[PDB]
Amino acid sequence: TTALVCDNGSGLVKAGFAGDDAPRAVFPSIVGRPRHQGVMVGMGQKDSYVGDEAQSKRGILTLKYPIEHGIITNWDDMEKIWHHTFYNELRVAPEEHPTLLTEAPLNPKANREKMTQIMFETFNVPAMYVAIQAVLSLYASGRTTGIVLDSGDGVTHNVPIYEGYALPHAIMRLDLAGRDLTDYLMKILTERGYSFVTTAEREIVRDIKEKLCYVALDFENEMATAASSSSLEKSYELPDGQVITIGNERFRCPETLFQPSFIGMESAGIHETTYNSIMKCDIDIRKDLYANNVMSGGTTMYPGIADRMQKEITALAPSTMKIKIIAPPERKYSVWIGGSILASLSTFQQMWITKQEYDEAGPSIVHRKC
Amino acid sequence: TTALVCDNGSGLVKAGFAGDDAPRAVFPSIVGRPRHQGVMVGMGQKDSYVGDEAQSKRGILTLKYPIEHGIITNWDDMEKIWHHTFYNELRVAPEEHPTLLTEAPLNPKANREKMTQIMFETFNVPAMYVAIQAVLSLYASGRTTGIVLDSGDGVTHNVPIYEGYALPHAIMRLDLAGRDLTDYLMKILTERGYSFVTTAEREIVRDIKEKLCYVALDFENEMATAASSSSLEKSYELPDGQVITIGNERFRCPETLFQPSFIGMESAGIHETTYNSIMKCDIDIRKDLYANNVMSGGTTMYPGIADRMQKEITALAPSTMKIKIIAPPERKYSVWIGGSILASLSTFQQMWITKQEYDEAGPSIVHRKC
Amino acid sequence: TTALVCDNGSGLVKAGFAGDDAPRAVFPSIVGRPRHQGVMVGMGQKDSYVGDEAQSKRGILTLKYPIEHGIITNWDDMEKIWHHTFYNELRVAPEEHPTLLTEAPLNPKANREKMTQIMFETFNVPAMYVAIQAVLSLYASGRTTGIVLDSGDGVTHNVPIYEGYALPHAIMRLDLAGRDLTDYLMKILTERGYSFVTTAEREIVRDIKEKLCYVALDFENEMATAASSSSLEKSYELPDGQVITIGNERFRCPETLFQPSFIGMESAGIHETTYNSIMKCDIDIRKDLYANNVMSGGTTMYPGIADRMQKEITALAPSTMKIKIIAPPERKYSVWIGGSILASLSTFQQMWITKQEYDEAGPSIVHRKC
Amino acid sequence: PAWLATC
Amino acid sequence: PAWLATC
Amino acid sequence: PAWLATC
Ligand SMILES: Nc1ncnc2c1ncn2[C@@H]1O[C@H](COP(=O)(O)OP(=O)(O)O)[C@@H](O)[C@H]1O
Ligand SMILES: Nc1ncnc2c1ncn2[C@@H]1O[C@H](COP(=O)(O)OP(=O)(O)O)[C@@H](O)[C@H]1O
Numbered sequence A, B, C: 001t002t003a004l005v006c007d008n009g010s011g012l013v014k015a016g017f018a019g020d021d022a023p024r025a026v027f028p029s030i031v032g033r034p035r036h037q038g039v040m041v042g043m044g045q046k047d048s049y050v051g052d053e054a055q056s057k058r059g060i061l062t063l064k065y066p067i068e069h070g071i072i073t074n075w076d077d078m079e080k081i082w083h084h085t086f087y088n089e090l091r092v093a094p095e096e097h098p099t100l101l102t103e104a105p106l107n108p109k110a111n112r113e114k115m116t117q118i119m120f121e122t123f124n125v126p127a128m129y130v131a132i133q134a135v136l137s138l139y140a141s142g143r144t145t146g147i148v149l150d151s152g153d154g155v156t157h158n159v160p161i162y163e164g165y166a167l168p169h170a171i172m173r174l175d176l177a178g179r180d181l182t183d184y185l186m187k188i189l190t191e192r193g194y195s196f197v198t199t200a201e202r203e204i205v206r207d208i209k210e211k212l213c214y215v216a217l218d219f220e221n222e223m224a225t226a227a228s229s230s231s232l233e234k235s236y237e238l239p240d241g242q243v244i245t246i247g248n249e250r251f252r253c254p255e256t257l258f259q260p261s262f263i264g265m266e267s268a269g270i271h272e273t274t275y276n277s278i279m280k281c282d283i284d285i286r287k288d289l290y291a292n293n294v295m296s297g298g299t300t301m302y303p304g305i306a307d308r309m310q311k312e313i314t315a316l317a318p319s320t321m322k323i324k325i326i327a328p329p330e331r332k333y334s335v336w337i338g339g340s341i342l343a344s345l346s347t348f349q350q351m352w353i354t355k356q357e358y359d360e361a362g363p364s365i366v367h368r369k370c
Numbered sequence D, E, F: 001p002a003w004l005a006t007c
């Protein structure tokens, strides 16, 4: 009579059990559809691939990310992904174990309602619930209060919490994630000489980004050093066998993440919006939030971002406000760990959303109870 | 010669002559700064934009407000707006005749000093002085005595005036005005599914608000019938042909104004604020004040705001004393009418702070003439 | 003290003096080399041919296009073409004539650096400068707002601009102008029976598509009525004296332009990418661009492309937004006209890249001045 | 782009 | 925010 | 083909 959990991030879905201490199933949230016609027979060629299959073979079909910026657009694709992660990844049944989904702040109540309606009508799950990745990462880290800053492939945001009490007026969001970052990197590479326009090329670009791209401390100094010397240039290998060289893009990408002006988006930086959100809180918790500031997500896995963020925020804010950024070595799965902990907890049981309750009241209960 | 009035609101600036019942310059106060380098040499001059031009074009450039919550931040933008309204809109030199300024209650004497210093130094005006929006609005309405509730774009307040004598410990002000209203509107619209994050989008949603937002009488029942029925909702057309719909946000935002708890600010509503300001006075004058409650400003331009306000203040007050609220259709320019009549009459002439007085004593003298 | 312009296209090249309203010397940018070793002695034979000479005598010479998709790959052939067009077609010394160059929006910075270095060193010119074909095509019509869709011989792109400020985050580029089109035409002709694999045959196909092929409105209906009724089969004569009939290829070629899937790509048609580029832009400039959308380039001369383009963009775009596509005659020379106008403008003179700047800061100065 | 209006 | 401290 | 990698 155990439970499970499944984060449906735009970058890749991560499903696992509650009693476990680490996720078991994890795979990109993509759907591939063939573009050619096909002549050979007997190979059992399907019509729509999902999971590691479309990643292993991607040059014969077009890929599609159903979730964009944390919003669903292909409900059929989402249902296919849920079926794959419930039946193929781990051989289980939904009617036998309760589920636990997660979403981002400001997500459409219509999106939440359709999610719960599909989960109830298609899989006939006994119970379900929805939460916010920030409090999940907090419960994972073990703390109670603090300001969470999450940054996934879909979107990024930050929110403060004080003894379990949230502050919606302090929540801040942003749509600067791995997608637009990879797009800008491909544009800069085209400016350099290397071309990447297709979906498989976009995946190769995401890979080389997560492998090489590193943030810097002084953007102007690093740019001058790169334009002067060549010790920073690196070399990457491609599946075609040929290699490519990379110079300043590896840190110009995170600088675009920090300066949306580089991409052409009128907004504020991550540090600026973080400070704004912190200032919208109460003075008696400003300090507690400065020190108890934690980061999460996969996009923030860049090396050297912790020191950069600390320097920026401490130079923007006054002194006598000692800061201690929480960036543990494991953060890509911190939300899953928090979800497992919450599901294994005892009290949270009484907070489940059952099937009969939905059938009686309706889907609106999801946004009416949590 | 004649006089001149120029009220500098948090969102707009209204300037004109005296003795007239209608202003000439009614234009917003926003500085436009391009976000792109520009490549064409033909038409690429005029780096910074001021006036209705920055509203006709607002996408390729960011808009900065000079006044926030009634307080000035950028003296450069303020003097730019002053030069624009003097030489471009009014097309009249400032040295010819004096001008009248405005300042909300409880504003920094340092800000008033900076204002008068700039006015007497840069423009070299023969005389100058600053007044309050409340007294001007009351003199425009023409009422003998009573309480006045004025709410501009970023500031709101209420003040009583009886027996021709102000009351320093009776004024009651709050920073919740159309700005936080449109912010919460953007938040609830993001909840709906749309999105407005930039400054041009902020002004677009501000237009939507000032166009199709109405106030309710019974919040809970109105929300219930709006969630059940779909006849009150209405659609709006965007400049690019896109269409949006609003069913509950229009009358939820006025409730947000009435319930600051939604915004998260632990304070009291406008009705409780007025009741407290009245109670702090003496009942013998409170009696006649209850019937004399004038409303001004653009934030109070909602259809039916008088009904909800009078109902709430009657429920909070005893029915033993007659009560009444008045708000003529000219809630916007009332301050301008007050300034015009005050500059037309001959008494206030003696109060004009002359250039001689300023240069022989300094700007700090304004601390006494208020 | 005069000027000079030389637009180097992937397929053609047009050079001459400024001030005029039409080009002076236009010719194909190709290089023909003899393949059959051994000639009749005494008469003499040249090593390589360029310009119209190659196209006039090509049955014995193999042709090479030194430009591919807007990128340079044969610097020797490019220098030879520049020498031929500067010393034979015009017979003018460039040492006392400031020239002007062109280049697609996104191209190798190394390519631009090599171009400027060659033009500065191997010619000893007083000054030079580069630009984008979009800006000159817009200057041709004179309008300063709107979007421009260019399509040359090997490269195509779309670029917006508003009041002189360009949106680099919306530019789009593709490699479908006339080369994959000629290849697909060869393929369909082979499918019909006629074989065309050589370079002279490639020029023959270029001519036959320039003279006969044209785009349609309803691809399926046109294919049906062509397969049923033999009223569209048109005859074309060859240099030898033969005659060949062509049917649905005239529709399939522009259809391949619109649907790259026939060529083996996954990118979308020109209409989809144009709508996407316009979407990334703000709403006001979206509206202002829907009205003024200009098309240029040699590929744009397909009879019936404006009507079909506007039909598709309206079908995929919302209503209440008039879409007035524009495509004036002599548009393939719009880039030259814009360059001539720019060179004639007195202000633009100050933007000239002189020789001292290159000798001091090297060729990288091209970026800073651009 | 997937907000039924802006973005 | 523009009160040199609170707000 | 002439992009030092793809195409
Ligand atoms: N080691 C790394 N360095 C830099 N970026 C990384 C690293 N690991 C993952 N990423 C980025 O993080 C993204 C994954 O986001 P993720 O945290 O899975 O979002 P969600 O929380 O919604 O599942 C990927 O797109 C990838 O680009
Ligand atoms: N017709 C309307 N309906 C609702 N709100 C309005 C209307 N017209 C103006 N407003 C609001 O009033 C504000 C303008 O305040 P204003 O009266 O100019 O302040 P001040 O008196 O300081 O100049 C705007 O921010 C706008 O949101």
Ligand SMILES: Nc1ncnc2c1ncn2[C@@H]1O[C@H](COP(=O)(O)OP(=O)(O)O)[C@@H](O)[C@H]1O
Residues within 6 Å of the ligand: C007, C008, C009, C010, C011, C012, C013, C133, C151, C152, C153, C154, C178, C206, C209, C210, C211, C297, C298, C299, C301, C302, C332, C335
């Ligand atoms: N009348 C026409 N009909 C169809 N195609 C044409 C016509 N004229 C030129 N073209 C095509 O346009 C191409 C020339 O491209 P061009 O506009 O010169 O590129 P660029 O702008 O880079 O110089 C040629 O390859 C040719 O196939």
Ligand SMILES: [Mg+2]
Residues within 6 Å of the ligand: A009, A010, A151, A152, A153, A154, A155, A297
């Ligand atoms: Mg995420």
Ligand SMILES: [Mg+2]
Residues within 6 Å of the ligand: B009, B010, B133, B150, B151, B152, B153, B297
């Ligand atoms: Mg006001």
Ligand SMILES: [Mg+2]
Residues within 6 Å of the ligand: C009, C010, C133, C150, C151, C152, C153, C155
């Ligand atoms: Mg071209």
